[PDB]
Symmetry: C3
Subunit: 453 residues, 3 copies
């Protein structure tokens, strides 16, 4: 009953990009993927995407290639093999209108079914319709035709209802009308709007469903329009989170990707970034500058101005300010990671604290461990990485240098300032540092001394 | 002459919160506290706040409890014991309209006094009055009644003047009208708007004072409206600071709490956060990402992308970028705290420099001290914290580990890379590190060496 | 044919500033410099700037001083010596209207030439013209006069076309009309608008060119208007970059100075700051919080939440998060600078890595060097700075302390935790640290041990 054609071969010159236009991201997914999601709401039996140059990349729906730019008519014709003969209602939508909703496309197909139209145009009203196709209606307010700006009479220029370039067609007629135009065109290019002209010649019924919101119809041709799309999608996402019980200091300046999940009672300061497959648990606090990519954060956590990537963070964890949790990290329940701390490829057990100026790389760390300020786990020799194992209740002295592969046994202490080259037994202390020597009056000889300035 | 009732027991379902609705913060204080401040402008002899569930928490004005949700009429009746019999003008205001100003409530009470009204409604005009109570006026433009959306005739739906749910009543009549409705209601619930209906029955004079600004009347029911309130209050606060001589790169994206004080000639970049009892002195520069909580900052300071909490910062101080001044710190005149430095529970004397990768905790530090990059004050043994005392003109070597409790005497130098376990006399040097040994050609054996890749 | 007078002596009381008003910056240059750039579009033979108090500072165009505030008429008269007698069209513009474009001033002078006017007023339409001079036209819609608010009839108050205080005059008449007013004034002050009154007395032809955009005419009197000017100029700059192929997550919250150059295909997250003579190469990624001053960044770089000042960054470089590249640094091709790293006054050769918690100051560093986490180059003795030279393929051990002046030879390794006081030959290792000693069961005696809590 329902088919979908997505036009993804249109010109992208004004993007000034080596990336095909429809692959440019809005809130973490391509414009094309936003259109795939809205198209999904009509439950189409077949979906055909028409691509052009760099087809391989877009493919890397059913796909067909448009090798030559001969207009939207030729584009739609590239789906003839797959859709010719079939009965039911065929949506034609651009890959560069990512703000059109599933609700809008459901209401388009229903309106078309409703009025037994051969074609239905998705229209919208704007007070500045310059450049757009105008929807011409009669006394009875039925759709007669689409008039382009260049063809518009001064009276027609007054028309505020415009063509969004989104349509539903009776599938059978659509492929019949295109062949007609193609063969009798006396010209190379042809346009999906040419089919509306043919239906006018035959008196076949064409209708228009108007979007309440003109801004939903945005067709992205450049990075100005890309940023407008980002602004609308950001507002849409953040609105949903607020209705679901998430507080935002500033939802106009908080950057949350389309698939991020956020539990009720979360508080988000301005200028928080959440990306990819990120999940935030109940009552967690995210402060200004926090940046989370493809990570799970538990309940009752506080992430202060920190960057967390491809990692798991348990309930009650405190991170920051200015901490970096790098890929394949796990922070256990109630872990504290303080300022200027980097964790990479490491598991950290519950209640463990690394408060300051510390690097934990390729470590397996137990519960109730304390990392002194300035602790470095040394994991790399210039060719290979080595694992360090740290047991429960270990006290790693400030400014210590732990050279993997070593094991620090349960309850051990590393003396502050120590270089550790060998395993430390459970309940031992290890000390690897110079003994302090004091030299009376020697500072009087040195350039910092007041007596020497 | 003036009384005030604050309705703080209304439903909060759409907030999706375990915190009562009116306690949700806007610019650093509860919505209820914003209403207490606007109510203060009418100098009320008595102020009564009606609370519901979690009453203890809101209490933790005079307070009365509404154990049962029987409507705003029952809410106002919970103040009968305290206000019954008294003469003068009684403001009724919701705890969830935090944008209404003192100026607006002064102009409401004056307008009511003016026209010897028995009731005055605070009204506003909007082009989308759907859902609101409509204010019905006559040829003479006097207020006849309030008509709810569900009762509105199609002609009444056209009315753009709405009820904000803020009122002034002649106190005597108000408690008389409520008893009447309560006893003869033939129903459980009753509404403050029911009193306006009764005055219509008796021909008692009801007037309306219209807000110039409809957006001032916002009643917060969800976190969408909470963020709108934050946006308006942020704009209001930042406007006041700009008129008072504070420059903002972007006042729509700068987050300054309601009671923060900012001297003239301060320059604030976008995305600065100032919270609580914070004070900023003249000509100080705050750069993007700066976050200050409950701190005093002097004149001619430059805070670059740094977090400062419960601390005092003197004139001429430079902090950042990426520094953390933690609670109970004092930075003396012209102190420099550079990148990746944490100061906690420490006093730092004038002209002292800690430029890099340093932790200063539980230290008393003198004037003209230099902390080398990588210096750690070690203050914690896993149970107790210990104090370090550092004298004037001390040179603390890079990458040194100072294990409290020790004293570094005036003009002393700690050798770079030293572990310090013992006091250092004034004018001494202390060195606690291994002597360098060179091994010819040994690097040729190791995995980093080009010859081994 | 074209002359320009810039009025830069007007009152600045509402700025609450010791800096003269026109020197306040918008997007990295003074409001006066924005006006110099728009004035440049008319190719003036002579440009005269009238300054007042702190004249020296504005001077630190031709300049003339207005020692006494006797109005804009007296201001323009201070240019009589330089412009008296000359023929051609004289632009009069304020130093505090920085949003007026070159295109607008070209269209003003052309319109004036066009209609052989003796005067032309730059006008604009607003729905709130309160306080402004009204432009009075006739049936034929010719400009009769300028009427100030205080002189306006109720009919004249309705006029929405306002005086922006920008003009073109026939130079000869202008200086003749001013002398007339000055001598016969019976008063101290006189106004450029008084010249329009005189032309009305003589029937000399006065015309008005209307700005399409009223907001372009903003005259900055306070820091509220300064921030509005910042908002418009930020939008203008960011629009140009987007049309030129730069992606912005949020162009309303990205802070790019007027002369910053940005290659096509650059991606900029929200809350990026680019200042001064900054240049960004093709396909470079700048993430949230990045702050660049007077620096060149190559192609295919990724700057993650980092501050880069007066430095050069080659192609392929990765910086951050939370790195600080300080003045007179150079990062060679494919260099990696990781979290909590500071580079100052240092050259770093290609493919060199400093991933963590490192300070590199006054160093000459070769290619394929590895800095271990926690490495400190010690460059300062409290009086003088010293240079360290590091060769190619050097492996600088984690937590090492390199005390300048030393040279680390090609392919050398410094043992982790080492203090280095002496040169290290090429292909050597250097070790300067305590040997690890383990003490069985000693941790059982210490306060961290579970058995002691
Ligand atoms: C900034 C923050 O995050 S704060 C939190 C971090 N906290 C810390 O880093 C605190 C770490 N504390 C230390 O390093 C301490 O110096 C300890 C706990 C190592 C000192 O312990 P003490 O038992 O008081 O030291 P003490 O001088 O008694 O020495 C203990 C043993 O080690 C030996 N020893 C001491 N110093 C050295 C050395 N440099 N080399 C070899 N052996 C040594 C002693 O001879 C003694 O052995 P013995 O009993 O066989 O003779
Ligand atoms: C990154 C930044 O922030 S830069 C700013 C920070 N600046 C610094 O950290 C600079 C610190 N400078 C140092 O550590 C220096 O190495 C000093 C100043 C300690 C070196 O001083 P010098 O006097 O040149 O050292 P010198 O080798 O002469 O040794 C002085 C004394 O200490 C002794 N000594 C030297 N090294 C050691 C050691 N490892 N253990 C014990 N004693 C030692 C010497 O024997 C000599 O004593 P003696 O005269 O009784 O024989
Ligand atoms: C966190 C990150 O960024 S990870 C990346 C950073 N990576 C690093 O920092 C790794 C650095 N690695 C090291 O420091 C290592 O300990 C090395 C590579 C110094 C150890 O090398 P090895 O050759 O295994 O050490 P080994 O114990 O064999 O000692 C080598 C020589 O030095 C001597 N030596 C060892 N320790 C010391 C010492 N403390 N003092 C003096 N000499 C010493 C040995 O006696 C031997 O000499 P000899 O052959 O004449 O007797
Ligand atoms: Ca389009
Ligand atoms: Ca260190
Ligand atoms: Ca309400
Ligand atoms: Ca002005
Ligand atoms: Zn990262
Ligand atoms: Zn903090
Ligand atoms: Zn800097």
């Amino acid at each position: 009953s329902n088919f979908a054609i997505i036009l993804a071969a249109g010109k992208g010159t004004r993007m000034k990009s080596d990336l095909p236009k429809v692959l440019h991201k809005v809130a973490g997914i391509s414009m094309l993927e936003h259109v795939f999601r809205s198209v999904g709401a009509i439950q189409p039996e077949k979906t055909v995407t028409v691509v052009g140059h760099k087809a391989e990349l877009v493919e890397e729906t059913e796909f067909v290639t448009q090798s030559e730019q001969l207009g939207t008519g030729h584009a739609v014709m590239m789906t003839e093999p797959i859709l010719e003969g079939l009965s039911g209602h065929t949506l034609v939508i651009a890959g560069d209108t990512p703000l059109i909703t599933g609700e809008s496309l459901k209401n388009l197909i229903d309106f078309h079914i409703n009025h037994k139209n051969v074609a239905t145009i998705l229209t919208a009203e704007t007070d500045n319709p310059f450049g757009y196709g105008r929807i011409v209606r009669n006394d009875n307010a039925e759709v007669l035709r689409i008039v382009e700006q260049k063809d518009a009479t001064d009276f027609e220029k007054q028309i505020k209802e415009i063509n969004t370039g989104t349509y539903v067609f009776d599938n059978e007629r659509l492929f019949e009308a295109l062949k007609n135009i193609n063969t009798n065109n006396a010209q190379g290019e042809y346009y999906i709007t040419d089919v509306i002209g043919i239906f006018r010649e035959t008196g076949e019924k064409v209708g228009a469903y108007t979007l309440k919101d003109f801004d939903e119809s945005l067709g992205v041709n450049d990075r100005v329009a890309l940023a407008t799309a980002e602004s609308v999608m950001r507002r849409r996402i953040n609105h949903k989170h607020m209705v679901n019980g998430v507080s935002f200091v500033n939802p106009e300046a908080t950057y949350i990707d389309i698939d991020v999940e956020i539990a009720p009672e979360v508080q988000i300061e301005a200028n928080v970034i959440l990306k990819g497959q990120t999940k935030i648990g109940a009552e967690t606090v995210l402060t200004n500058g926090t940046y989370v990519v493809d990570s799970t954060i538990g309940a009752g956590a506080v992430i202060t101005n920190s960057m967390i990537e491809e990692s798991s963070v348990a309930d009650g964890v405190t991170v920051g300010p200015y901490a970096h949790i790098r890929p394949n990290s796990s922070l256990g329940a109630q872990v504290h990671i303080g300022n200027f701390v980097e964790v990479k490829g490491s598991s950290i057990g519950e209640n463990t604290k690394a408060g300051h100026l510390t690097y934990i790389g390729n470590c397996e760390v137990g519960s109730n461990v304390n990392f002194g300020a300035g602790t470095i786990t040394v994991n790399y020799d210039g060719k290979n990485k080595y694992k360090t194992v740290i047991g429960d209740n270990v006290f790693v002295g400030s400014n210590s240098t732990i050279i993997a592969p070593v094991e620090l046994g349960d309850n051990s202490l590393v003396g502050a300032g120590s270089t550790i080259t060998k395993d430390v037994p459970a309940d031992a202390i290890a000390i690897g540092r110079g003994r302090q020597i004091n030299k009376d009056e020697y500072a009087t000889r040195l350039p910092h001394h007041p007596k020497n300035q």
